């Protein structure tokens, strides 16, 4: 039972640093009782339907299009947990508290929503987990997610990458004729100095240096 004293720092009316949630205009979950037993919606008239009797009043016509503005009724704010009180309500005394269910219905365990930042993880779970399975674990391998760079001129060996030979294969007689056939696309690089420079239309990045 009971409650602590008054502190103006906790009062939104006095402490202007407390930002007001306009979606909680008429709802104060800290005053909620469990189970909820307070009526907050009853008959409302004189909004568009007058509360008086003009059914057979030939001098009065009802125009609901002229509905006067009223205070907006926000959707009901869910209850917020009172941690300590909750941790004092569901607390168990070992070997001195009987294993029984009380007669009062207030012993029911009600679910009151808590902090929100935890669900931020739930917001980013499909991203982070995927990163955890592709970036942190580097699956399938290290070089898949890296930006693609071709190997340099004749690296790591002329067997895997016979670029120089390919150059000759495109500068020899036969190679030229092959390009004339149109079944072989033109050469996609040039050997300048000891470096291989890809043409702009090739569509690849330049090879990295041998640092």
């Amino acid at each position: 039972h009971h409650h602590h004293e008054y502190d103006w720092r906790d009062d939104p009316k006095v402490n202007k640093d407390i930002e007001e949630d306009i979606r909680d205009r008429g709802w104060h979950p800290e005053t909620y009782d469990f189970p909820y037993t307070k009526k907050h919606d009853d008959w409302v008239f004189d909004v568009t339907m007058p509360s008086q009797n003009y059914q057979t009043d030939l001098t009065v016509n009802i125009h609901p299009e002229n509905k006067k503005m009223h205070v907006m009724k926000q959707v009901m704010r869910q209850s917020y947990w009172d941690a300590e009180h909750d941790m004092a309500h569901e607390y168990d005394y070992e070997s001195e508290d009987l294993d029984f269910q009380c007669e009062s219905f207030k012993s029911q365990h009600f679910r009151k929503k808590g902090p929100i930042s935890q669900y931020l993880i739930l917001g980013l779970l499909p991203i982070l987990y995927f990163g955890t399975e592709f970036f942190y674990n580097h699956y399938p391998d290290e070089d898949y997610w890296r930006v693609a760079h071709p190997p340099p001129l004749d690296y790591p060996d002329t067997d895997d990458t016979d670029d120089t030979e390919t150059f000759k294969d495109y500068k020899s007689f036969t190679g030229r004729r092959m390009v004339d056939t149109g079944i072989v696309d033109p050469l996609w690089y040039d050997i300048r100095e000891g470096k291989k420079v890809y043409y702009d239309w090739a569509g690849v990045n330049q090879p990295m240096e041998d640092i």
């Binding site: 189970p35 037993t37 009901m76 269910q101 219905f105 029911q108 365990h109």
Partner: protein, 53 residues
Amino acid sequence: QMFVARQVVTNSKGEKVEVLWNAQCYEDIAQLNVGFAPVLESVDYHWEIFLWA
């Protein structure tokens, strides 16, 4: 959500009895609002649906 309607009738005993048409759910107690306020919101979330077994 407690009672959708109220009614006053007279039985064969001449008594002015009260009948409260409750709010129902379609086969799902999960979809039933187990509340004790004259409202329409589902404010109460009971962890133990059958508290006293």
